[PDB]
Structure formats: structure tokens, C-alpha cells
Design a protein around this ligand. Structure first.
Ligand SMILES: Nc1ncnc2c1ncn2[C@@H]1O[C@H](COP(=O)(O)OP(=O)(O)OP(=O)(O)O)[C@@H](O)[C@H]1O
Ligand SMILES: Nc1ncnc2c1ncn2[C@@H]1O[C@H](COP(=O)(O)OP(=O)(O)OP(=O)(O)O)[C@@H](O)[C@H]1O
Ligand SMILES: N[C@@H](CCCC[NH3+])C(=O)O
Ligand SMILES: N[C@@H](CCCC[NH3+])C(=O)O
Ligand SMILES: [Mn+2]
Ligand SMILES: [Mn+2]
Ligand SMILES: [Mn+2]
Ligand SMILES: [Mn+2]
Ligand SMILES: [Mn+2]
Ligand SMILES: [Mn+2]
Lengths: 485, 485
């Protein structure tokens, strides 16, 4: 109880003493190895080899454990690569260091050491220190379950599983770039501040640029800019960056999230389906070492094709008692939708209602990697219209673990059609839809110069990271998740 | 004059005719080569080889030029890789295609072709078409000098020099990541939305999160979050992403810009100076093929050390008549500063005034790569204090071409000191400084758990791209620069 406050007092008093001796916070010690490197290279050698090899190394990190056994002590040092053992002896270090310094330090303190490698009796790699210093005094002792997100630094210091998740996240992004670049895609950077937001249907965050006295929006998606680049000639482009949506926090929603959008000219959604399946198979293999991934109580085989259903088949499959003819009549669909709890807004049309039914009925059940095709035109203002049925577009979305992971389609390169769909969106907004798109005249103009037939795909990177790290909340894969005040 | 309006009418009428025939905008043609690939592999072969090789290929792109010479025509097709010649003959293509289709197309139209490779009389690589289709009808004919930025797609279609600049930008970013990863740095993603902005001194953009009824700011810098990660154990981290500052547009300022911040524990600013010099030498060599870079009327030798001066030496060197003792007296410095046009604010102290004098006096003259050291503590609230002179910090900034390219320093890991400097910043804001930092209690707490001695560096990526593409305005290296309404 008060033992924590005495820890704080003791640390402040120890620091006060450092201040009297000179510069309490130096920046001089230099290491030449991290724990992971030492283990990788020497774990395999026995004390005989290490003895004859007589290798001296320098490390630095946090003092996680210390066991003082008189004139000798054993310490666990934790650095960016992991942990390494230190053997600290009074007569191995310079005079007075052991008793006047080392013993006065505290767990959590950042220290630096230089010594010779050897293996303990237990067979562990250890460093027989010949030099040891205090680099940074820790004024606070080593660390709801919301603290993990409120003070991510404590979570990273304490939980190796959490560290691993974020290291894997970095590995995945690097692997995605390598995968895309290998296919001739070029990474670009489009605006995050837009006067006219678009590319998706969402409530945007709004701000003000004083210099131009201009109201602006944080981008909800880079889609319209990326397609402008394809018109410009960058026929294989991708962007992996933040999107912002003014909506509430959830187990799979963060106000700002990372997404990858890619566009490849002279391709259709079928090509995106193949790319998606290859990306997941490649990432699982390259990053996890296997194509079979364990997530919760399930196993995803990214080595076999994703399942594929139309939106209606998914609805019929998860609500078998559904009279499919109901989805063809506005009144029947509206009634059906409401019967299952969906509040049908005045602006909604049949296509929107059917899509909403799909969300309510099937989304949660798409556990194994699944592609859902035939999205209604009403909810896809930027997607290419299907050749045989104009009411649907050549678009799909894919789900894994009951969550939507991606969205893709053959792009709409028909300027006149696009302008009309933008007008419908404007009417919708006027009829109450706060997520309807804004009319973008310059985008239409770009399409008039000519956009090659193209296929674009958007993938939620955070949602994807969850599947590769067995995380069941998006808050576990975002270093600093948005939190309630 | 009206000839443009007849171009528009003619294109709309041609499209109307396509609509009557069926689906005007197909998405079916697939290519297997881009122009750059064809040239790289076959430019070196003469017509004899190509003839015996009998290679058939498929390409797609924009029809840039067409010369109809009766039953045969010559076309320049432009794709993502560049341009390739097409040989279009009535009797080489399927019946009626040449006369009923090909001749009706327009420059700018997106087309697809399949044919055999050969070399023209002029010795150019060309494709003797056996199949040719119209993929996308262009409703507008091929393209102040502000249009380039207002409709970047037209600029990319028209100017190859502009395309090259952006391709090089992508190459540079990829090269930076490779450089950093080679040094054990791990790329992370920190928040772009922050309740308390910090890490720099700037006017932020503010927005509102409806869900939490919480006012938030677009990040002006990720610094405070990145250092939290170093405390957490990610001792070598970097982030390359957008920053937002509520300030006016300029030749070197965009409201949103890309920056790289990197932090490496157990290092000081001297280590950052070496890293900076190696990064520029590596990028110039790897990307431009030489360490000597031509920019405007100058040549930068990234093969030799950057010049290095203290802030005072730079001031003395560019305003030789300066009585250096003036920089040691608030009144003299204030008078000096005002005499050269600087409006001294009530909140400013000596350190701030001297820094402002440096900006006015020397910044523009630092043409060759230069490091400026000894930044006053007043203008460096997050930097490590110098051991011998507490009034200055172990920080530097570097300039190239009269513009600031980077900012780095040994990080402040003294929690008590940091808290105090935050308080001074709060007082400053209360005294009128609208760019002063906000007090960040959680950041101070993170430092209390212990931040290893660290060196951090921030580099303006757009400013850096300018130097490698001979661009003299930041608007030439950002795909969609911020523009006045
Ligand atoms: N708030 C969010 N947090 C994290 N990822 C998100 C969020 N919103 C959307 N995404 C991801 O971005 C992708 C593309 O955006 P899209 O507009 O399709 O999302 P969405 O369908 O609105 O998402 P959901 O159905 O999960 O609410 C989604 O497929 C999803 O993976
Ligand atoms: N508006 C901007 N547009 C582009 N790059 C910028 C902008 N503001 C700052 N930078 C870059 O970000 C780096 C780090 O931010 P910093 O706060 O040091 O900039 P700054 O000193 O305010 O810039 P300047 O002196 O050029 O106005 C700068 O060194 C510069 O390269
Ligand atoms: N912009 C879409 C993803 C890309 C769709 C294909 N053009 C979204 O935000 O969901
Ligand atoms: N945050 C600084 C760059 C990093 C400084 C070193 N900690 C800036 O915005 O200029
Ligand atoms: Mn949503
Ligand atoms: Mn959805
Ligand atoms: Mn969706
Ligand atoms: Mn500035
Ligand atoms: Mn500056
Ligand atoms: Mn600066």
C-alpha cells in the first residue's frame, strides 16, 4: 500500500544523490550487441568453446531481475531483442562499483554492461561483467486491463506476448510492401486533408485551415485520388496509410485505422480475388511459417481457396426460412429488414435494405475466409456495373473471423454514370443519409479524360493483423488505440 | 476556340454510338507487358533476330499519337512504363476493325493491342498488331501553370519529367526503409489524432470526435509517442508519415507533409550526424547513381562531410558586423533582432531571440549541406541539456539549399527537467505563444519509468525529395499539394 510510495521516495533520494555527484543522466555508453544477437550466435556453444573464444561484448537495457548473493550477483537484462544474463562480481568490476553503485540501483533502472561471454551451470548464455554502469535511474518501479492501452509502454515492458504482436505487425507490413512491389505496384502518398471527402460512406472528421479560412475533412479513404493517378498513368499504385472516420470505438473499429488501397489497370475483381488469396497465403507462410493459422478456436487454411458466395446466397444460408422473393420487393424487404431489428431510414432503397439484411444476417457467420459478391449498385457508387444485371456491381468484400477484412471491385470508369451516381448520393444526403458521398466534379472530369478499365482493392490492415497474431480486439494490434477520456 | 467544343461533342457522339452497340466500357482485355519491359529486353535485337524470335505480346495504354497513311497507320502507345510503337494495318487486324473502329478512335483513348515484335526502319521497337481494341473512350482531348497541381493527372499524362520526379520519390522512400531496416530499426505507426498535441511547436488543426464528444488535434509530430515506445523497449524505431500544421502554404511548406522520425537508444546527436551523412550518401549513390547531385545552379557532394557550425558561428559568418556580445544581453539581442526586422514577442526570452536572429540572418545562406549545432534550451523543450552549458542543448538542425531539411538531438530523459520545461511552455502560451507546447503529464510519467539515453532525428521527406529531383518548390514533389480555393 504505502510500500509503493516508499519505492518512489527511495528512487527520488537516490537520484538526488546522483545529481550531487554530477550529471545524473549521461549519454555516453555504447553497446555493440543486443540479446537476440548473442543468443543466435552463441547459444549453441558450450563453456569450453566460449572460454577459448574469449568474446567480449557490450549490452544495455533494463534491469529486470537482480539476485544479490554477497560478493556476486545475477541479473536479467532486457533489451530490444529480449533478455540476457549478467554475472556481476565485486572483484570483476572496478573498485567500489559493485558496492557503492550496483547494489544501490533498482529494478527498472536502465544499465549498461561490458564483459566476456560464457555459459552458466544451467547452460544459459551469460556475460561475466568487467564494467557496469547506471544509464537512467527509474523513478517508478517496474509495472482495469485498460492500463495496457492507456500506458502501452508498461505493457511492452511487462508482456512479451504483446511485444511479439507488434513486432509481427511490422513484419507483416514489410512483407506486404515486398509482395506488392514484386508485382510492379508503386507506393504513393495522397492527401489526408481533403476539401471534399469521398471514396467511401462514412461520417468524416472536420477541421479548419486558418490560413485559407477553409473548412476541411480528414480523409475517409484515398480512393478518388488513387484513381486520378491511374488516369495519369500510374497504372499499378498502392497506398498503405491512415483513414479517419467519425464513428464510435469498438472491438474492430478505431477512429483512425490503417488501410491499404491498391489499383491495377487492365484487371477486374476476379484478379483481385486471386491477389487477395495469394497475399494471405504468402503472408502466413512467410511470417508465421505455415499456411494454417490458429485464431481463437478456429484454424484458417490460407493454403486453400476462400469460400465464395453471392450476397443473397449468404443471406439464404444463414436465415434459411427467408423467402428470397422478399428481397425483390421494397415493401417486403423493408418489412423483412425491420423484423430482424434493422431501422430502415427514409433514404434507403431496396439495394441498401438487402445489404443491411446481409450485414445483420450473415456477416458474423463468415468465420472461414469468405468472399461475398454481387453488391447492389445503390451501395456501390464507385463500382463498375455488372454487364447482365445493372442493379448489382462487379464488387465483393471478404470476411474472416466474422469480420470484414477487405472491399474490392472492378472500378467505374464511365464518367456519365459516375456523375449520376454522385447525384443520387447527393439526393440521399438531402434525404437524411449523413454518410452519403459528396459530389466531386473534378473526379468526374478526371474520368472524362479516361480511366483505363481497372480493379481496386481496400484491405483493413489492423483487422488483418488481428488474424495473424490471434488478437480478438483491434485494440491489441494498434500501439496507441483510441480510448475514452 | 470552338474547336475544343467540337472535340467534346464528337467524343460524346462516338460514345453514344458505343452505347448502342452494347457495353461501352468493357473490362476484359489483358496485357502481359509494359513498354519499359519490351525496350529493356528487345531494344538490343535487330529485325533479323526479332523476326526469327517471332515474339507476340499484349500491351495497353493511352493513344498519344496516330498517323493514318491509308491502309497502314503508326501509333504511339503510352503506358505506366513509357511509350512503345504500334504498327496498325487494315489487313493485319480482323476484318472491319481497322476502318470501322480504329479510325474512329481519338488521341487520349485507352486502347489495347496484341502483336508481334519487330524493329522499324528507324530502328525503333514496334508491335505489328494482329488485334486492337478500344478499352476506354476519352471524352476530353489530351491536355496558369497551377493547373499542373489542380489536375495532377493531366500533368502526369503530359510531362514525363513530372512522372520521373514521383517515381524517384517512391524509390527514395523505399531506399530509406531499406537503409533503416538494415540498421535494425523497426517501423511503427503512432496516432495521428491526439488529445494533447506535442513533439514540436506549431499551430495544430483541431477537430471533434462526436462519439466521445471530444475535441482532438491532428498530430504536429509523433515524437512523444515514439519515445514512449523506446521506454517500452523498442529501442530502434522509426515512423515515416504525415504531420499536420495549421500554417500557410509556401514554396517549402504544405499544411500536411511527410516526415521521418527515428530514435535509437544508447546514442547521442553525433551518431545522428553520421547516420544523416550516410543516408544522403547512400540515397544519392543508390538512387541517382552518383554522390554529386546537381540542384539548381549548385552541386552537392554527398560524398564529403556536411559543413558544421554552431548557431552563433553561422550568425557571425553571415552578419560579420554583429557584436556577438549582443547575443548575451536580452535588451541588446532584442534590439539587434528588431533592427533586422524581427518582431519580438513578449513571451520570447534570449534563447528564442538568438534563434530567430539565426533564422533571419543565416538560414538562407546554408546552401551546401550544413549542420547547425548548439540550439538554446528555450527553443528545445524536449532536448538533452548540454553538460557544460545548461543554456544550450545537444541538438542540431541541418540545411541544404537554404532550407531546413532535418532536426535532431540527444533526447531529454530527465523527467523532472522535462516537467519543468513543459511548465515553462505553458507559461509561454499564457504569455501569448500560440505555438508553445501543451503539458503532457502521461509523457512525464513515461519518462519516470525510465527512458534510455537516446538520440532522435526528424527529416522532412518532401524537402529531401526536392534535392534529389532538382525541384525548387515543394509543390513539385507532393502529388496533390494543398491549393488556394
Ligand atoms: N473503424 C475502423 N477501424 C478499423 N478498420 C476499419 C474501420 N472501418 C473500416 N475498416 C476497414 O476498412 C475497410 C474498407 O472500408 P469500408 O468502408 O469497406 O469499411 P466498412 O464496411 O464500413 O467496415 P465495417 O463493415 O467493418 O464497419 C473495411 O473492409 C475494414 O477492413
Ligand atoms: N509545412 C511544412 N512542410 C514541409 N516540411 C515541413 C513543414 N514544416 C516542417 N517541415 C519539415 O519537418 C522538419 C521537422 O519539423 P520542424 O518543427 O523542425 O520544422 P520547422 O523548423 O518549423 O520548419 P521551417 O523552419 O522550415 O519552417 C523540418 O526540419 C522540415 O524539414
Ligand atoms: N475505398 C474503399 C476500398 C477500395 C474499394 C475499391 N475501389 C473503402 O474505403 O472501403
Ligand atoms: N519532433 C521534431 C523532430 C525530432 C526531433 C528529435 N527528437 C520535429 O517535429 O521537428
Ligand atoms: Mn462501418
Ligand atoms: Mn461492411
Ligand atoms: Mn465495406
Ligand atoms: Mn516552420
Ligand atoms: Mn526552423
Ligand atoms: Mn526546426
Amino acid at each position: 500500500a504505502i510500500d509503493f510510495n516508499d519505492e518512489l521516495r527511495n528512487r527520488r533520494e537516490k537520484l538526488a544523490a546522483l545529481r550531487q555527484q554530477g550529471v545524473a543522466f549521461p549519454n555516453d555508453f555504447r553497446r555493440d550487441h543486443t540479446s537476440d544477437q548473442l543468443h543466435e550466435e552463441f547459444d549453441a556453444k558450450d563453456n569450453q568453446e566460449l572460454e577459448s573464444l574469449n568474446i567480449e561484448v557490450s549490452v544495455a537495457g533494463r534491469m529486470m531481475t537482480r539476485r544479490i548473493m554477497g560478493k556476486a550477483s545475477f541479473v536479467t537484462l532486457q533489451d530490444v531483442g529480449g533478455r540476457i544474463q549478467l554475472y556481476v562480481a565485486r572483484d570483476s568490476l572496478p573498485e567500489g562499483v559493485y558496492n557503492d553503485q550496483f547494489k544501490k540501483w533498482d529494478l527498472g533502472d536502465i544499465i549498461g554492461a561490458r564483459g566476456t561471454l560464457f555459459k552458466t551451470q544451467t547452460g544459459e548464455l551469460s556475460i561475466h561483467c568487467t564494467e557496469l554502469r547506471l544509464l537512467t535511474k527509474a523513478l517508478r518501479p517496474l509495472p482495469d486491463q485498460e492500463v495496457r492501452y492507456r500506458q502501452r509502454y508498461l505493457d511492452l515492458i511487462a508482456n512479451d506476448k504483446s511485444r511479439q504482436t507488434f513486432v509481427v505487425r511490422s513484419k507483416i507490413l514489410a512483407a506486404i510492401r515486398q509482395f506488392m512491389v514484386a508485382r510492379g505496384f508503386m507506393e504513393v502518398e495522397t492527401p489526408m486533408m481533403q476539401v471534399i471527402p469521398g471514396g467511401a460512406s462514412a461520417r468524416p472528421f472536420i477541421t479548419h485551415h486558418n490560413a485559407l479560412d477553409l473548412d476541411m475533412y480528414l480523409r475517409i479513404a484515398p480512393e478518388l485520388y488513387l484513381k486520378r493517378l491511374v488516369v495519369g498513368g500510374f497504372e499499378r499504385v498502392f497506398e498503405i496509410n491512415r483513414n479517419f472516420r467519425n464513428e464510435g470505438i469498438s472491438v474492430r473499429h478505431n477512429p483512425e485505422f490503417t488501410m491499404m488501397e491498391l489499383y491495377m489497370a487492365y484487371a477486374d475483381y476476379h484478379d483481385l480475388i486471386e491477389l487477395t488469396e495469394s497475399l494471405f497465403r504468402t503472408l502466413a507462410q512467410e511470417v508465421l511459417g505455415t499456411t494454417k493459422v490458429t485464431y481463437g478456436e478456429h484454424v484458417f487454411d490460407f493454403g486453400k481457396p476462400f469460400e465464395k458466395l453471392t450476397m443473397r446466397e449468404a443471406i439464404k444460408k444463414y436465415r434459411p426460412e427467408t423467402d428470397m422473393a422478399d428481397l425483390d420487393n421494397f415493401d417486403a424487404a423493408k418489412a423483412l429488414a425491420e423484423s430482424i431489428g434493422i431501422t430502415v431510414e427514409k433514404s434507403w432503397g431496396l439495394g441498401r435494405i438487402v445489404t443491411e439484411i446481409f450485414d445483420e444476417v450473415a456477416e458474423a457467420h463468415l468465420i472461414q475466409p469468405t468472399f461475398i459478391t454481387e453488391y447492389p449498385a445503390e451501395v456501390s457508387p464507385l463500382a463498375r456495373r455488372n454487364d447482365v444485371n445493372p442493379e448489382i456491381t462487379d464488387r465483393f468484400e471478404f470476411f474472416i473471423g466474422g469480420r470484414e477484412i477487405g472491399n474490392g471491385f472492378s472500378e467505374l470508369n464511365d464518367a456519365e454514370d459516375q456523375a449520376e451516381r454522385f447525384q443520387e448520393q447527393v439526393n440521399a444526403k438531402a434525404a437524411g443519409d449523413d454518410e452519403a458521398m459528396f459530389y466531386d466534379e473534378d473526379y468526374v472530369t478526371a474520368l472524362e479524360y479516361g480511366l483505363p478499365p481497372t480493379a481496386g482493392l481496400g484491405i483493413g490492415i489492423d483487422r488483418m493483423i488481428m488474424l495473424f497474431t490471434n488478437s480478438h480486439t483491434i485494440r491489441d494490434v494498434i500501439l496507441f488505440p483510441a480510448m475514452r477520456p
